[PDB]
Amino acid sequence: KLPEAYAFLNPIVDVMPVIPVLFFLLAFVWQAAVSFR
Amino acid sequence: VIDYENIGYLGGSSIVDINNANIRAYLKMPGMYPTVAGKIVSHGPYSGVSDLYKIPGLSSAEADVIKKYESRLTAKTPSPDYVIDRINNGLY
Amino acid sequence: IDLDEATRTVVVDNAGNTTVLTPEQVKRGKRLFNATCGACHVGGITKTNPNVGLDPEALSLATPRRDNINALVDYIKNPTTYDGLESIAEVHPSIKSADIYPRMRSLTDEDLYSIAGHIMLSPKIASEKWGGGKIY
Amino acid sequence: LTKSQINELSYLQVKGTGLANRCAEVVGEDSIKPKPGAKLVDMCIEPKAWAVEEEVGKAGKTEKKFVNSKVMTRQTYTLDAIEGPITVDGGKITFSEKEGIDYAATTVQLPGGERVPFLFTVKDLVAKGNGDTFKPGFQMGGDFNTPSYRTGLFLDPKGRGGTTGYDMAVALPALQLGEEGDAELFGENNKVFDITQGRIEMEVNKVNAEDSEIGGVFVATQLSDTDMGSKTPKKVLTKGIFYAKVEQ
Amino acid sequence: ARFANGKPQSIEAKYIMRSPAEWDRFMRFMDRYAEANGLGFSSXXXXXXX
Amino acid sequence: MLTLKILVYTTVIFFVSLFIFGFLSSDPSRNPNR
Amino acid sequence: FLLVIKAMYLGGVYDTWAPGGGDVRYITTPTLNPIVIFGYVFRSPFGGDG
Amino acid sequence: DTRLLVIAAPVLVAASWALFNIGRLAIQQIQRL
Amino acid sequence: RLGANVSSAQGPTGLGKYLMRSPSGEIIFGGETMRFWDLRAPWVEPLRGPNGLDINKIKNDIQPWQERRAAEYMTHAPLGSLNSVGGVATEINSVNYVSPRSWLCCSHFFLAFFFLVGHWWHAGRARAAAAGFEKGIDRDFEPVLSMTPL
Amino acid sequence: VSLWERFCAWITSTENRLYIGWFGCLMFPTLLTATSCFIIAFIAAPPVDIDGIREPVSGSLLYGNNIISGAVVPSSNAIGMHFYPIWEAASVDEWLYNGGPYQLIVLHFLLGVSAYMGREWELSYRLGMRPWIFVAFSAPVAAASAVFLVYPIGQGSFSDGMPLGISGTFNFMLVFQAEHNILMHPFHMAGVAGVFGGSLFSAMHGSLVTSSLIRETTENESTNYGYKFGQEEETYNIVAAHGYFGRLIFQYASFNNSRALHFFLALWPVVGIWITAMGISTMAFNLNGFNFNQSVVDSQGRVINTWADILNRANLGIEVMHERNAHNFPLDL
Amino acid sequence: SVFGLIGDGTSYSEGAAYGTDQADKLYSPYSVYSPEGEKSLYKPDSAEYLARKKAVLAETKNRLQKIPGYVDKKEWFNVKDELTRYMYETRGAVRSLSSSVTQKEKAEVFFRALEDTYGAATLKKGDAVKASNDKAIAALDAFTA
Amino acid sequence: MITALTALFVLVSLALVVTVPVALATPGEWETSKDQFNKIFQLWVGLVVAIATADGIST
Amino acid sequence: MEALVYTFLLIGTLMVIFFAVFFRETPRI
Ligand code: CLA
Ligand SMILES: CC1=C(/C=C/C(C)=C\C=C\C(C)=C\C=C\C=C(C)\C=C\C=C(C)\C=C\C2=C(C)CCCC2(C)C)C(C)(C)CCC1
Ligand code: OEX
Ligand SMILES: [Cl-]
Ligand SMILES: [Fe+2]
DSSP states (O other): OOOTTTSTTHHHHHHGGGHHHHHHHHHHHHHHHTTTO | OOOOSOOGGGTTSSOEETTTOOGGGTTSSTTOIIIIIHHHHTSOOOSSGGGGGGSTTOOHHHHHHHHHTTTTEEOOOOOHHHHTTSSOOSOO | OOOOTGGGEEEOSSSOOEEEOOHHHHHHHHHHIIIIIHHHHGGGSOSSOTTSOOSHHHHHTSSSOOSSHHHHHHHHHSOBOSSOSSBOGGGSOOSTTTTTOGGGGSOOHHHHHHHHHHHHHHHHHSSSSTTTOTTO | OOHHHHTTSOHHHHTTTSTTSSOOOOOSOOOOOOOTTOEEEEEEEEEEEEEEEEEEESSSOEEEEEEEOEESSSSOOOBEEEEEEOEESSSOEEOOOOEEEOOOEEEEEOTTSOEEEEEOOOEEEEOOOSSSSOOTTOBOOOEEEEOOSSOTTOBOTTSBBSSSSBSSOTTOGGGSSSSSOSOTTHHHHSOOOOOEEEEEEEEEEEEETTTTEEEEEEEEEEEOOOSTTSSOOOEEEEEEEEEEEEEO | OOSOOSTTOOSHHHHHHHHHHHHHHHHHHHHHSOSOOOOOOOSTTOOOOO | OHHHHHHHHHHHHHHHHHHHHHHTTTTTTOSSOO | OHHHHHHHHSSOEEETTSTTSSEEEOOOSOOOOHHHHHHHHTSOSSBTTO | OOHHHHHHHHHHHHHHHHHHHHHHHHHHTTOOO | OOOOOTTSOOOTTSSOSSEEEOTTSOEEEOGGGGGGTTOOOTTTGGGEETTEEOHHHHHTOOOHHHHHHHHHHHHSOSOOBTTOOOSOTTSOSOOOOOOHHHHHHHHHHHHHHHHHHHHHHHHHHHHHHHHTOSSOOOSSSOGGGGSOOO | OOHHHHHHHHHTOSOSSSOOHHHHHHHHHHHHHHHHHHHHHHHHOOOBOSSSSSOOBOOSGGGTOOTTTOEEOOOOTTTTTBOOOGGGSSSHHHHHHTTHHHHHHHHHHHHHHHHHHHHHHHHHHHTTOOSOHHHHHHHHHHHHHIIIIIHHHHHTOGGGSOOEEHHHHHHHHHHHHHHHOSTTSHHHHHHHHHHHHHHHHHHHHHHHHHHSBOOOSOSSSOGGGGOOSSOSSOSBOHHHHHHHHHHHTOSSSOOOOHHHHHHHHHHHHHHHHHHHHHHHHHHHTSOBOOOOTTOOBOSSSOBOOOHHHHHHHHHHHHHTTTTTTTOOSSOOO | OOOOOTTTSSOOOSSOOOTTSSOOOSSOOSSTTOSSOOSOSSSOTTSSHHHHHHHHHHHHHHHHTTHHHHHHTTOOHHHHHHHHHTTHHHHHHHHHHOOSHHHHHHHHHHHHHHHHHHHHHHHTOHHHHHHHHHHHHHHHHTTOO | OHHHHHHHHHHHHHHHHHHHHHHHHSTTHHHHTHHHHHHHHHHHHHHHHHHHHHHHHTO | OHHHHHHHHHHHHHHHHHHHHHSOOOOOO
16 A cells, blocks of 8 residues: 555556556557658 | 275265275264374274274374274275275375 | 345354344455455365365364354364364464464454355355365 | 585585485494394485396207396486384394385386386385394395385276276277177276285495494395286396494 | 586587587688788678678 | 587587588678679 | 675665575675686576576 | 545546647647647 | 375375485475476475485474465466466466466567567568668569579 | 688579578588488387376387377476486487487477578578568467477476377377367467468468469460469459459458558468467466356356356366376376 | 446445445455455454564574584584574564564674574585574574563 | 645646647747746756655654 | 388378479479
8 A cells, every 4th residue: 555645646556557558559649640641 | 906895985885994995084973084094094904993992102082082983984804006095095 | 046035044153043144244255255265265175185175064074063153263263173182273374373374464353254154155055066176 | 425425415516416316335344233122214225237037048048047127217216214123033133124215116128128117115124134233244134025016096098997997998889788798808907906025135244333324235136017917027136235324 | 417517518528529610610710811900891781891 | 428429519519610600701791782 | 786786785685595584684795706607607598407 | 435436537537638638739739740 | 294104105106106206316206296306495495405305304394384385385376367367277266366477477478589570570671771672672683583593 | 712712602602402501501400310310210219208107108100100199209207397318318228218309309390490490581681582581480480489399498398398290289289278278368369360361361362363364375275374484464463353352342441552462461370370379388387368267147146157167167177187197186286 | 237337326246346446334445455454453463472482482592502513513404404494483583572772783693693604504614604603692592581 | 745745746747748748849839938847847846855855754 | 010001101202202302393484
């Protein structure tokens, strides 16, 4: 368990690790925005 | 052997042989499986049930609990393929 | 068929008194048992020592009788051998060996009651597989 | 090397080297004169040469001779840590083996490609020394029995065994359905387990009194394996060295 | 077998004889390539100069 | 059997050195275009 | 170097083979013999060698 | 109330839509996307 | 504990079901685990002597903590499934556990091979591009037509 | 002109009937010794104990086997992962008793196939073509390595490798199913999809190309005789084939850049086989397939069987029977 | 029927819902992810485990006075095995029994002595092993406090 | 306080991340608005130092 | 005695393979 100070901020930590995967996708969505130039 | 004659005394029936059955057979009798059945199965062949009570070391309490079930035990001729597997039959 | 009132009644004491487990109890047990007991007693069998099973028949032949909630709870408080000659707390999970096994450092009474209730109740549901083994 | 030298070596220094089978030597010939009630705490029996009784013709005549044979199993044959109580009936030392690693599965290959498996064992041994003090020149001798190479729990390739398995050859159902069914096959369907006999003769050599250790040379002749009564067993002759420590 | 071992030389003979093969190759290779110090081509994997 | 080990250790180092010094002998230059 | 320094003078590292059970200890005397160190590098990768 | 669910869905929420918001703004302000 | 004389009970094959001899002569555990006789663990070393597994230490000087450690390790083996059922493939799903060793080994083996594939691809392309025929052949300087027939 | 130079030249020559190259210096001797030992052992190898329980198994033709039952039995379980060359045995007979030829053949075969990949690339470089055929050949090489080397490494014994034979292969597959549940692993599914798709695309591409063949032959002469080696124009009409394919399924759905079509043809089975070899490699470290055992439960709690439970039943049947005498304890670890 | 939306639009279930992360009422699931509670029921921190720890320390002594006999003979595996097989519980026992600063510091001294004994026994140096055993004896019999 | 202090830090980090990537891209935008970004960076590092000081003290 | 037949078949197949590599129709352009 997190220290008692940050147990309130726990839900952000619940999603933080999966962020990078989304960066990947962003590349794809960015390429889609520019018409796969 | 293709047919052991004393199948019923291996643990299937209420009568259990003391010179052939594995330690798992001494589970129908409460208060006997550890420290009592092990002594019986860890020692040599017995000509009769009375030979159990001379088993070296056999404590009193063990003698009493054996006397409680003396009727169910029986003594048959030993068979090597079964006496070798008294401690660990193989099945679990 | 449901998990009705009739099937949730289990023996609570040697006498034979039969109490009833609330559905919450059932859930908590199944959870606690799977979390702590499950690794070695999955399916109602003892993985390390298959001779001493967990099915009601073997509990009925233990010394003393272990086929009721009270004796199971006491066994958790103080475990003994199959014939009850001595204590095996140093080689088995127990409240007495809480220092040795850190898993029980948090278990409460209700927790023990629910675990014992689950152990008693599961053979009433499955009725042939609790402790049966591969074959079943 | 002696036990006092192996105890200096650590386990990492010994692994793989292959000296785990070797028997420690004994130096400084002396007499023990065991106190009655003492017993041999350790005992290693190492075979140095194997031979199988065979028929071979020298000059047009055939006679029973023991032919040499190389061992197929790598480094398993040696026995060790055998314990037994020494007693004196009429002033004679009797080993009387009691417990310890005393069996060892071993396979040896004869000239011509024949493979002869056998159980190199010392069980229920009863030695009869030629006196008392284990002193240079002592002899023990004795007899022992050899258990079945395969126990009851073993299954044949077709699934037949003694304590467990099919009682008949399920692959051939036409052998059934006929009054006298599987009979020619009864010799193989039926699994019998019989104990054999072995004769060992141990001669003592240099004996250390300070460490209470004895060493010498043994000659043993044991009956080979019978495949649960399917084949007649062979005769195996073995010779080698030994070592034992007496605790008083 | 499992005796660790620097490379797998157990007998000085084995090392001293795995030696001449590599040295024979070094000599035959030196026969072509000798007295080379400079000639820097400065190009992508050219090595055109012999 | 030490002789057999010696002969195999030769063959192996023989061919391995052949490989190593063959790929060291200006292989990238060996090519259709020059 | 930083890892070595951490294990030697910055609280130590966890050692299972420590006497009395696994615990954090300082590695006071690391083995510096080149032969024993490179025995790992130059040994066989098969069973019993690792 | 499983505030855990109402806490874990909406944060996954904000995070998943954020980068696409950056894409919004870049295409809106005629950026060197 | 039952009183059986360990190191004297022949196994079903006659090989010894508790103690065996390693192909180097060392004394090891019997059964199918004879393939793993090279093991060295902190909870089993106290029982090992220069000759291998000492018998006098096993018979007399055994420790309860070793028993607990062995039971815990047997009950938690690096066996599992993709959905992390745990145990043997035929076991019912009550436990929920897959050892981190399995995860690390499988994932990194997969990554390592695909990076070997990356090496193959990039080495080939880099050398072809340096040579100068990574786009095609030429159609006017085809090297096959300039070579002797065969 | 030195000697080394002359050699290097002959070696990298592209006018030899079979290209040698520098990778050939590793491929030829190694593959040749592997095949010689394999041919000899398949005919006259004595029985070998594989489970290390002194129960030798015969796999040679001269020991009452046929082509299907015969095999090169893998090394003994007592050896495990240890290196067992000829010179480590005390006698050749003992080396044969413990299954050394399996180790010899498998190690040489692996080195040979790796050198074969290298040689494919080397000839591609010499002939001035694009160097990626050996990348395609990597997939069978990866599969062979996983089945012959990686799985024994993970399991801890060479006795767990695939025996070199037909019935041995079937036994290996069945035991793999029992102990690992290969079928319910998504990578095996990907491999089956890849192989079925490879066959589908091969058949369809062949049919489409052969169907649209320019009429340049009579009827009493093989259609194949219309094409002449070293042509300058396409012997088939892409337009007609694409029209047929588009009308068959859909207009949008269709490949036109024949280059893209051939790249897809190369891509599908290769990625399938790569994923399958990864399934085997991952499962060598006991990461088995999905276990949906007793997942469906009624209100009371009783279990309702699905199709997966019958698979578990068959797996139990195989498991309790494989290596009947090898086991002494309840768990197969 | 019998829906079960993430514990927000239905109910518990004799077995089906998992989102829960609560819905138990028993009390505090230590963390939203732990079925177990906090250390406030049944087992107490220092019931009578201190007696077991003291017995472990006494038998640790009894084990450690037989090391000089084993080093007098040239046996090194026995020293390591004796120092690790029963001293295993002694590290945790000594760490838990120590509560004051002096006990902590000199238990650290004792651990240093044992580690030196182990290292010297591995290196096979009789003098260093004997001196380290003497220092370990001094620390351990000066620990009983 | 810590809990709150950080909350802020999270909010200011979100406001910074949503606007830095948009700035840099949009040509020119950067330079013109450099000093405000520097001020917000100093605010960010000050918040981090304040959070660290909280903990320390509170332990 | 069937081992002879199996060996003959395998060696014959290998010989056929040998003849198909070194005695092939040379393809000309
Ligand atoms: C319809 C059902 C079906 C189908 C289509 C498949 C399909 C497949 N299974 Mg399978 N399987 C099934 C049912 C099925 N399975 C069932 C029911 C079970 C349970 C019993 C299994 C259990 C199973 C296992 C256990 C394995 C498979 C594997 C495979 C794959 C084969 C890999 C292969 O051959 O390429 C790989 C190609 C090679 C290995 C060839 C390499 C060739 C080398 C490089 C050169 C050889 C040269 C040669 C010696 C001489 C040249 C000739 C010269 C003389 C002219 C493939 C995806 C295997 C796998 O996962 O792939 C690794 C595998 O190990 N399956
Ligand atoms: C740290 C932090 C954070 C985070 C942040 C970050 C760093 C980032 C995020 C972000 C992210 C990470 C996001 C992402 C997103 C993504 C997405 C949104 C994706 C999607 C995609 C898709 C879905 C696609 C699709 C498509 C298209 C479009 C076209 C083609 C086809 C396809 C299908 C591919 C926060 C805020 C919490 C705050 C605190 C701290
Ligand atoms: O060797 Mn072939 O199969 Ca892999 O698991 Mn354990 O070992 Mn044996 O049993 Mn199951
Ligand atoms: Cl086993
Ligand atoms: Fe084509």
